[PDB]
Amino acid sequence: KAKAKSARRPTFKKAGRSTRASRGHTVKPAPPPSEAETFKMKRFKNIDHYKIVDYW
Amino acid sequence: MREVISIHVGQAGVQIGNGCWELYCLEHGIQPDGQLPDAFNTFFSETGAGKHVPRAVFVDLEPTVVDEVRTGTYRQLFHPEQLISGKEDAANNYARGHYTVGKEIIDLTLDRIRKLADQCTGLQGFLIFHSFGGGTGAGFGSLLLERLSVDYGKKSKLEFTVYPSPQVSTAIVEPYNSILATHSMIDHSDCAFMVDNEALYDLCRRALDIERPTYTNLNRLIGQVVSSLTASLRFDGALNVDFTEFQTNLVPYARIHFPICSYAPVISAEKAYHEQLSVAEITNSLFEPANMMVKCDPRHGKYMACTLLYRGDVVPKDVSAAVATIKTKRTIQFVDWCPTGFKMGINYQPPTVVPGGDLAKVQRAVCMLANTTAIAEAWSRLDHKFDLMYAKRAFVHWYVGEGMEEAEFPEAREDLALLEKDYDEVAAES
Numbered sequence: 446k447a448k449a450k451s452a453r454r455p456t457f458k459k460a461g462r463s464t465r466a467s468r469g470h471t472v473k474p475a476p477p478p479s480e481a482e483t484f485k486m487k488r489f490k491n492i493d494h495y496k497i498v499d500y501w
Numbered sequence: 502m503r504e505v506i507s508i509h510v511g512q513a514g515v516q517i518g519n520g521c522w523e524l525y526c527l528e529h530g531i532q533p534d535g536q537l538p539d540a541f542n543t544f545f546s547e548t549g550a551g552k553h554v555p556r557a558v559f560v561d562l563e564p565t566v567v568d569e570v571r572t573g574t575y576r577q578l579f580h581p582e583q584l585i586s587g588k589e590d591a592a593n594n595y596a597r598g599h600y601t602v603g604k605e606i607i608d609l610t611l612d613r614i615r616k617l618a619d620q621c622t623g624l625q626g627f628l629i630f631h632s633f634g635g636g637t638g639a640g641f642g643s644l645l646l647e648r649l650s651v652d653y654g655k656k657s658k659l660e661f662t663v664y665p666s667p668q669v670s671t672a673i674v675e676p677y678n679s680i681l682a683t684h685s686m687i688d689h690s691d692c693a694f695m696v697d698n699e700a701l702y703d704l705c706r707r708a709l710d711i712e713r714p715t716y717t718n719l720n721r722l723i724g725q726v727v728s729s730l731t732a733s734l735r736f737d738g739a740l741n742v743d744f745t746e747f748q749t750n751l752v753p754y755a756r757i758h759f760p761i762c763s764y765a766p767v768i769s770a771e772k773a774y775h776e777q778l779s780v781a782e783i784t785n786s787l788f789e790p791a792n793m794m795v796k797c798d799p800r801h802g803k804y805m806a807c808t809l810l811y812r813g814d815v816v817p818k819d820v821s822a823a824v825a826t827i828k829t830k831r832t833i834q835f836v837d838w839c840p841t842g843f844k845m846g847i848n849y850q851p852p853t854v855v856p857g858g859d860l861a862k863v864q865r866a867v868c869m870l871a872n873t874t875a876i877a878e879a880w881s882r883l884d885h886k887f888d889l890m891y892a893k894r895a896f897v898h899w900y901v902g903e904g905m906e907e908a909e910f911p912e913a914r915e916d917l918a919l920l921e922k923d924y925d926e927v928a929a930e931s
């Protein structure tokens with residue numbers, strides 16, 4: 446009977462709960478942005494100063 | 502009197518222009534032939550007849566667009582000299598329109614603009630139109646400005662350009678031409694205005710009620726803004742604004758000049774049955790991001806000085822209350838070192854409607870020119886698109902073969918990077 450108890454785990458057909466259709470329906474959050482959106486090339490990306498004379 | 506000269510470049514500039522001149526001739530009361538069935542001196546010249554002539558020059562490197570005017574109804578209005586057409590276009594190549602094909606016609610055009618300035622006793626500025634993606638618009642426009650800068654010098658050269666859209670694009674090589682042109686524009690231009698087609702499509706469908714527009718409807722909306730801008734010099738008003746005032750008030754520095762445009766009310770007029778469109782209503786409609794003619798939301802950035810132009814029944818008492826209200830709005834930011842922040846003008850003449858029109862004959866309207874740090878969003882996109890192509894050198898061979906040297910590509914790329922941090926440093930406060 447302990448074998449029978451181990452056979453019937455307390456799930457009692459709370460198994461296979463998530464189906465293929467529901468996983469299609471569920472909301473998926475936004476992923477990280479692609480590398481293509483990042484692309485400003487390095488040497489210009491790194492530039493330090495400006496041409497505007499705002500300081501005194 | 503006081504005169505303004507119009508120069509039109511490329512397909513966009515020319516066919517925007519005939520939209521502008523159909524507006525003015527209808528406004529002043531001049532038939533298309535130049536006869537009549539005031540402020541004519543500001544835009545037209547009189548001859549030894551009852552006939553008038555516009556102060557305009559149309560320039561393009563291919564004859565199809567200009568020849569439409571030559572066989573059109575308006576052919577009798579323009580002087581045959583004013584219509585200048587090349588032999589073969591620049592093929593959306595900046596180098597071809599700047600070095601090889603541009604120099605074939607540059608000196609022919611410069612005689613004609615200079616000759617027109619002789620008749621302008623009280624010349625105060627020029628108006629120049631561009632489309633950035635076109636080879637002639639960017640390439641030949643840069644060559645025209647460089648020469649014009651030394652020719653006239655201390656005269657206000659204003660420009661009205663179409664910024665390439667954030668996502669809508671008609672040229673693959675479009676990012677290359679805009680950045681190279683931006684170098685020549687920034688040092689020589691006194692002040693230039695941005696609009697983009699993508700926002701003008703959205704406004705013309707949402708505010709105006711058209712299912713399917715063409716460039717014709719967009720070109721008429723642009724003409725209204727220029728009409729309101731120039732109304733101060735032509736017709737009476739309680740607060741006049743000259744061209745030179747725009748140069749000083751709007752731009753805080755030399756390199757940060759680029760403002761954006763707005764206009765209100767833009768309404769399909771059956772919707773105008775329901776509302777009276779008071780001064781407070783039109784003032785509020787200016788500041789919504791939906792009404793911007795450039796598809797960049799000001800809420801990402803901040804406002805520097807803004808210029809307001811009112812036309813029609815507006816009264817100076819009602820203006821002060823309206824702008825006071827917009828200062829209370831906490832959806833609108835202003836940089837700390839611009840507490841004043843405003844320049845206002847009032848004119849009495851309401852806008853003019855056109856046969857086959859799109860807009861209403863409303864009794865009052867307002868136009869806006871605002872300088873904002875939100876334009877830094879547009880520069881980042883254009884710069885990013887440029888770097889993708891340039892890393893693998895996707896289109897350089899076409900430019901180099903047409904007289905361009907490669908070293909101009911990174912140097913023009915450096916200045917935009919400086920401009921990008923020019924906008925970031927100014928956006929800070931202390």
Ligand SMILES: Nc1nc2c(ncn2[C@@H]2O[C@H](COP(=O)(O)OP(=O)(O)OP(=O)(O)O)[C@@H](O)[C@H]2O)c(=O)[nH]1
Pocket residue numbers: 510511512513516517561562590591592593594632633634635636637638639663665671698716717719720
């Ligand atoms: N608003 C508006 N934009 C236009 C119009 N015609 C062309 N454009 C814009 O002009 C941009 C491209 O420039 P082009 O039309 O090629 O002008 P261009 O300088 O003569 O080019 P080339 O043929 O090489 O001489 C496009 O993004 C269009 O959206 C127009 O009638 N109205």
Ligand SMILES: [Mg+2]
Pocket residue numbers: 511512561562563590591635637638
């Ligand atoms: Mg052309």
